[PDB]
Amino acid sequence: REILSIHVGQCGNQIADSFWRLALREHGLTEAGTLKSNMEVFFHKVRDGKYVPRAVLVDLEPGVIARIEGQLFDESSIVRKIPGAANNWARGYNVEGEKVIDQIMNVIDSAVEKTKGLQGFLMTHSIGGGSGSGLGSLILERLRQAYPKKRIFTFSVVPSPLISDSAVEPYNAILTLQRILDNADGAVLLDNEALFRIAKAKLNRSPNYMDLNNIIALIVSSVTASLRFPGKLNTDLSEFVTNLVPFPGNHFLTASFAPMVRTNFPDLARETFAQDNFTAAIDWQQGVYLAASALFRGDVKAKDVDENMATIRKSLNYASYMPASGGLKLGYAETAPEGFASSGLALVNHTGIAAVFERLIAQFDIMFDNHAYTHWYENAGVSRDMMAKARNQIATLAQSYRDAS
Amino acid sequence: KVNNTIVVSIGQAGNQIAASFWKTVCLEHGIDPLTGQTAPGVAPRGNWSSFFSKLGGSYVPRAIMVDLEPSVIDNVKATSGSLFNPANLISRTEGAGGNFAVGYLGAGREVLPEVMSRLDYEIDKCDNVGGIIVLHAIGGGTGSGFGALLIESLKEKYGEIPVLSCAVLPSPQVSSVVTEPYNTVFALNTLRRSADACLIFDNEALFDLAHRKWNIESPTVDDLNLLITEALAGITASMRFSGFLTVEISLRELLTNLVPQPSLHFLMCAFAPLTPPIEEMIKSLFDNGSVFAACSPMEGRFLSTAVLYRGIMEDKPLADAALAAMREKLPLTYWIPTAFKIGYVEQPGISHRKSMVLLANNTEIARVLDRICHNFDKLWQRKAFANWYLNEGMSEEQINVLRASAQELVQSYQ
Ligand SMILES: Nc1nc2c(ncn2[C@@H]2O[C@H](COP(=O)(O)CP(=O)(O)OP(=O)(O)O)[C@@H](O)[C@H]2O)c(=O)[nH]1
Numbered sequence: 001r002e003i004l005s006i007h008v009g010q011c012g013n014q015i016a017d018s019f020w021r022l023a024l025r026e027h028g029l030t031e032a033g034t035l036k037s038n039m040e041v042f043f044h045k046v047r048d049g050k051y052v053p054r055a056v057l058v059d060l061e062p063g064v065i066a067r068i069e070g071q072l073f074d075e076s077s078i079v080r081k082i083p084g085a086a087n088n089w090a091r092g093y094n095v096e097g098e099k100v101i102d103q104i105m106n107v108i109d110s111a112v113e114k115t116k117g118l119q120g121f122l123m124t125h126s127i128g129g130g131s132g133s134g135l136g137s138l139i140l141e142r143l144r145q146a147y148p149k150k151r152i153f154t155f156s157v158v159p160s161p162l163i164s165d166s167a168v169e170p171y172n173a174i175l176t177l178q179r180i181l182d183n184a185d186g187a188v189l190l191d192n193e194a195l196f197r198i199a200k201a202k203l204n205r206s207p208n209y210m211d212l213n214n215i216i217a218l219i220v221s222s223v224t225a226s227l228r229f230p231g232k233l234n235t236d237l238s239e240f241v242t243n244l245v246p247f248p249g250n251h252f253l254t255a256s257f258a259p260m261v262r263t264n265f266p267d268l269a270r271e272t273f274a275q276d277n278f279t280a281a282i283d284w285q286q287g288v289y290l291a292a293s294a295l296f297r298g299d300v301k302a303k304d305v306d307e308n309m310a311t312i313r314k315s316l317n318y319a320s321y322m323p324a325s326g327g328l329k330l331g332y333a334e335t336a337p338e339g340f341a342s343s344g345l346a347l348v349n350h351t352g353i354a355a356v357f358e359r360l361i362a363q364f365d366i367m368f369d370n371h372a373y374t375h376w377y378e379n380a381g382v383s384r385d386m387m388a389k390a391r392n393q394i395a396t397l398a399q400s401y402r403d404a405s
Numbered sequence: 406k407v408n409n410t411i412v413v414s415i416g417q418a419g420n421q422i423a424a425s426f427w428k429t430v431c432l433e434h435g436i437d438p439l440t441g442q443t444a445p446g447v448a449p450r451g452n453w454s455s456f457f458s459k460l461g462g463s464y465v466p467r468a469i470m471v472d473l474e475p476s477v478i479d480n481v482k483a484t485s486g487s488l489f490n491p492a493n494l495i496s497r498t499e500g501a502g503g504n505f506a507v508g509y510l511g512a513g514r515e516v517l518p519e520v521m522s523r524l525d526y527e528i529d530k531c532d533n534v535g536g537i538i539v540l541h542a543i544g545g546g547t548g549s550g551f552g553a554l555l556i557e558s559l560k561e562k563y564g565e566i567p568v569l570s571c572a573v574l575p576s577p578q579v580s581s582v583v584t585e586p587y588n589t590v591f592a593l594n595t596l597r598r599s600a601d602a603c604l605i606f607d608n609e610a611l612f613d614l615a616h617r618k619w620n621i622e623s624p625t626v627d628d629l630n631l632l633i634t635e636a637l638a639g640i641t642a643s644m645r646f647s648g649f650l651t652v653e654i655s656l657r658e659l660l661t662n663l664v665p666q667p668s669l670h671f672l673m674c675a676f677a678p679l680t681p682p683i684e685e686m687i688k689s690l691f692d693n694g695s696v697f698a699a700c701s702p703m704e705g706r707f708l709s710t711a712v713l714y715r716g717i718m719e720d721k722p723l724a725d726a727a728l729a730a731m732r733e734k735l736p737l738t739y740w741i742p743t744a745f746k747i748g749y750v751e752q753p754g755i756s757h758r759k760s761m762v763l764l765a766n767n768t769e770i771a772r773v774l775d776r777i778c779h780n781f782d783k784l785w786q787r788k789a790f791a792n793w794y795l796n797e798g799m800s801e802e803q804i805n806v807l808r809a810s811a812q813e814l815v816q817s818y819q
């Protein structure tokens with residue numbers, strides 16, 4: 001019952017920013033850690049008012065970590081590394097990754113050596129970067145091989161379909177998703193344009209990344225809500241692995257939070273499992289649900305949760321191997337985020353997230369055949385053969401989803 | 406600390422563009438350019454250490470100026486004061502005079518050790534250099550010759566360091582030196598061999614961009630270098646500003662995003678808005694004449710474009726959707742589907758509260774060089790002006806190799 005959070009990259013670090021901005025007052029503390037329901041799973045005991053979130057903000061070209069420290073973290077565990085991230089996965093893996101992995105894993109095993117008992121890791125990053133992609137992949141590699149009995153969860157922002165912020169980001173995405181496969185037993189994928197449209201629906205003016213990462217932060221908070229807010233029908237990360245991962249390598253999740261508030265519970269539950277409310281733009285029409293976890297929290301009523309079966313027997317489409325009334329991991333938590341009397345999270349193992357994967361595949365299917373940006377990898381130590389086999393693994397995973405329909 | 410970048414300026418156009426560039430960058434930071442000292446009570450705006458140094462102290466630019474004639478260095482000192490370190494400024498007497506070989510084999514060899522000693526001094530004060538911006542005009546003599554020698558010596562000594570060149574091409578409206586084709590091709594060979602990137606300007610495009618689209622009946626060269634300076638400020642703001650919404654882009658980051666192939670490293674630049682100090686602004690960034698090179702890139706083929714917005718961002722989903730819609734009617738390489746790096750900077754420029762800079766890789770730029778090569782077809786079909794090239798130290802077969810390398814570049818693009 002302890003969480004070590006890993007934050008690599010600018011996107012992952014802003015996700016972490018918003019994540020603790022809401023997690024601190026979700027337990028009644030300010031952003032700086034001052035006191036204004038076992039909340040010690042995320043936080044280490046340092047001072048009676050300062051409950052320190054032990055999360056490593058390791059990131060090449062730090063830049064943003066300065067504005068992170070301006071909300072107080074543990075300054076010893078985090079590092080503002082010498083810059084030079086670029087958007088190269090190999091540059092975060094073996095060029096400058098090899099000169100930071102010893103220090104970051106010394107920090108990590110010092111953080112977990114003082115742990116009474118650990119459940120796993122929740123890493124927030126973006127697969128499309130160069131720091132959060134390559135450094136995250138290296139951390140996954142040397143963290144699975146160090147603690148094979150622990151359960152790494154990755155909250156990765158997949159690059160947007162409509163427009164791109166990096167010109168080599170599908171290379172990075174695929175060659176980090178391969179490491180997420182080979183090194184983690186759980187993954188929640190985030191898509192940016194879905195977050196933009198959700199925040200457009202939620203608010204009345206134009207949002208930005210801070211609102212998107214607030215939504216992502218609500219997602220991550222409700223992921224572990226049943227673990228740190230013990231009510232009835234508790235949920236654990238081991239339970240997430242057991243009942244959301246039907247096959248050994250199929251552990252990529254799409255997440256929706258509701259509402260977007262003294263709302264009527266049927267509306268909250270039917271809008272929680274809404275095809276347009278999920279935070280990753282995945283394939284719903286042709287896709288089906290493998291394993292949906294409904295984690296409701298706050299002013300939730302057990303009969304209300306269990307009687308909202310209209311949205312499951314009407315809107316939710318399941319695979320052939322799951323029972324019609326099954327496919328639900330139900331969870332109750334006594335505490336919901338503020339502004340919500342009762343709120344809900346849908347964590348779905350779904351076929352349509354493979355569509356997410358395949359769009360990166362599509363980009364890789366046009367770049368590798370044209371020798372597009374591969375010299376940036378070859379001169380950095382990552383050859384074309386390992387990129388090809390990483391894409392082969394990712395395509396096999398997407399085909400596993402397509403076969404699991 | 407942030408990844409560093411030194412801007413070495415060679416030749417007259419390079420030195421004057423450097424003067425204007427550090428002027429506008431300093432006044433973006435809130436630093437007086439004519440003095441080099443920070444404004445009291447005001448902190449530097451953004452990551453100063455990328456392009457500057459607190460020399461004890463003063464926020465001095467990390468700029469090296471070499472020119473084989475005293476006039477340009479003296480004029481830059483007059484227009485800039487104590488902004489640049491005099492140790493960074495190296496001058497000779499006779500000049501190169503449109504002769505590449507003086508800067509390559511001649512006074513260039515004599516001036517090389519002092520320039521490289523100063524460059525080693527500056528890089529030893531760098532935390533992590535991730536780019537060297539060579540501000541020069543390859544049409545000129547000193548610029549071409551010592552830019553070639555300097556980038557060759559960098560790649561001989563260093564080579565982990567990205568090199569972004571910012572070269573001013575000869576104008577197709579008029580030539581300023583008749584040996585501009587010689588100098589341009591001779592420096593272009595070493596740019597393809599040694600420089601990891603090259604940014605291309607052209608005076609005629611900036612003239613038509615600042616004549617009717619700046620409401621000046623006839624701009625000076627100061628407006629030319631000011632437009633180039635707005636371009637460079639927008640480009641380096643990614644290397645210069647960091648924060649939450651803004652994404653930090655190193656020059657190696659901008660290189661890895663903008664240079665797909667090792668020989669495909671020549672970039673066009675454009676600026677918006679084209680108004681004296683949104684969708685119409687989106688298209689203003691992407692007009693056929695908005696690029697800072699006398700050519701039409703919209704019949705070309707954008708390899709990859711760094712679109713760097715800077716300013717207040719009140720339409721982030723709307724502007725992302727506008728960029729996505731604009732991408733549909735632009736010529737993009739199929740083999741780079743992710744050909745957009747949408748860089749954001751919260752802080753705008755000083756001239757505008759809302760600006761964007763296009764920094765694109767386009768095949769069109771090659772045909773630009775092709776016309777210079779066409780001009781090279783005039784000076785060597787009859788063996789003209791090449792007596793001093795041969796006498797200064799170079800050889801005819803070497804020059805044929807250089808021209809073949811330029812043709813190899815142009816054929817590598819297309
Ligand atoms: N949905 C969100 N996307 C974000 C957020 N922050 C960044 N991004 C986007 O994620 C995408 C890539 O993430 P990053 O480049 O920041 C990951 P990283 O820092 O490791 O890249 P480098 O430092 O350049 O190596 C890009 O589109 C960013 O604009 C965010 O808070 N939410």
Ligand SMILES: Nc1nc2c(ncn2[C@@H]2O[C@H](COP(=O)(O)CP(=O)(O)OP(=O)(O)O)[C@@H](O)[C@H]2O)c(=O)[nH]1
Nearest residue numbers: 416417418421501502503542545546547548581629
């Ligand atoms: N945008 C700007 N372009 C300039 C400026 N000065 C010159 N140029 C352009 O540079 C081109 C000529 O290159 P230069 O002679 O200035 C370079 P260099 O001093 O190395 O030549 P030599 O003295 O013959 O050795 C010409 O097209 C000019 O229009 C300037 O201040 N700004």
